[PDB]
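Structure, all two chains, one model.
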Amino acid sequence: MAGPLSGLRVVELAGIGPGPHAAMILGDLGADVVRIDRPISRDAMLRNRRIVTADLKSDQGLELALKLIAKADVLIEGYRPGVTERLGLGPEECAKVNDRLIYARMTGWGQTGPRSQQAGHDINYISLNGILHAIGRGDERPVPPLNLVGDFGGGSMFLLVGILAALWERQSSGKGQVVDAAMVDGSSVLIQMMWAMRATGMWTDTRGANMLDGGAPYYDTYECADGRYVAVGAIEPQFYAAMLAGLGLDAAELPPQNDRARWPELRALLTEAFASHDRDHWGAVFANSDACVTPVLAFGEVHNEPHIIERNTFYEANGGWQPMPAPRFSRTASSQPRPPAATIDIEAVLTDWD
Amino acid sequence: MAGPLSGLRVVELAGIGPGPHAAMILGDLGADVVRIDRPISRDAMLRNRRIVTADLKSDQGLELALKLIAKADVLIEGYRPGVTERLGLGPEECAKVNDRLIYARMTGWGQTGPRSQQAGHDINYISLNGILHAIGRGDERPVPPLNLVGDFGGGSMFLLVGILAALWERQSSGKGQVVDAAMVDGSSVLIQMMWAMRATGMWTDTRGANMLDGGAPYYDTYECADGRYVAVGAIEPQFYAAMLAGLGLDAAELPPQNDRARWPELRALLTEAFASHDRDHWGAVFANSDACVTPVLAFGEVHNEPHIIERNTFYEANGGWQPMPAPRFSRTASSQPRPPAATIDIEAVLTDWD
């Protein structure tokens, strides 16, 4: 198996959302991941796995799972706190068979506290920590940024960091430990820049009136003549200048870039200019420039974009594109992910693993 | 220094956005991070560092930088590709003095390809890979989800995963290597669940008309009587039922949860219900059940929320709150972050580092 994590052994207890995303990336980077499900997937997320089944409620299934775990470097579970405990797969039971184990617990609310036993989804975790409030236009109710911030950016990505950090630790202690990855925590560290900026007046709690939330005319999307969109990210003055130059707008006729009182005016002039030609016109105009103007591509156009083609950011799988592994490694590179395959015998995996 | 990365040595070449956020998390987890800037910060992001200065364009500063890199495990740089090369600090130069170095390159577009020399910001990277298009209400232009998805979720977080994975590879190869972390790549892997769902009919390219983008009446925010908001995330039928009960709605008088044709009707009945009382009323109705209803808190209210208080997700600093380290480790726990302190002499760090 190719990649920097070649040799690493991971048991994943089948769940939804952040846990399988974390397992996927481990497999992408070359880890040997074995997912235990209940008694061929068309879910591309289950790439780079071997799937086995066990009833964790039976004596036989518990025993087979504990034998797998005994040979593994990492366990990923995403149930409610207390669930693995009651199954006999809790941290203390795993430690008896394998004290080198990195026991990774993926939850929204965390292992303890008043909400720890309560159901939730991404939108709920980001509603409690100020994140969701900060997303969307100021004249409307907050919009969910899909499940990118809670489930993934502040969820599976923190599980991954904790797993890999604890493996580093084990190189010198010889021992594993438990990683408590709560999406409410991870997402807060994900948005630390905004917490930093609040303290210095560089960010306000007012929705849609900051530099990065759509409040700034030079950091937003604009609708073009064809009803398609461009993104403008021209924060730095020399980038802003390049953007005006391509629009053919005279700076001396516009409000200054950062005169906030005239941002309505500035936005209306930029709106009119971008609305005068189609999206693809602006790709030609701004070619090879620092104007920070890009087309807003829909998913179904992405694979035709030259920078995406040339870098092989995606690969073609089962009637659709899927993202290639990230990040990239110069010496031990990842390969194209292996598709989901048929279930296999758990006894066969133990034998492979010894 | 407390945490699982105690003993790790990191040189950070001062930059903005993704690079310093990755350095921050390494520090938060115990790494010994030394940031080289140009010749006391009030930026909480620069916590858990030592700051030194050097003019990398001069013979003396380059030589001092190279001596630091000689002793480090990890180098973080976020300039345009080619910049460290021309300074004398490219991967091939650093390998000469330290072949165990993890050379970590944080860009938007990546090290190669047609856009790789062009300026940009978060909004631009997520415009090119279909993510930005997918965010916001269907009747308005796309809204940026701040810089959470490109800079951090698909940016620093993949740089971290690359660093830590390469450290694992290094344990058996005895060598480091170069990590190419491009935001356009990382963010695509962050959104892999949507790429999966597109291939199985579970996601459309139509904006604002999906299960997780605000298209579903049971996965969105609602405005309450006081003009404040709740978030509803009641996907599963049992969670949906608990939500209807809290609202005092009789299920028999509503359309079925997943009768999409009647989702306008359902949303209108849900709108009217939530509008009848203020946010904190619903926060109390729904405080314990599995209804998946949470109050939408603004940043300045977060620290008063019980679940946030009890788990110490935040700590006080400067004049406000900052997130504590995440994720959490049961044996080698992180400490409260150290604030940015005064600059120090580079030669002293070299002494300490031997």
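The radius of gyration of chain A is 24 Å.
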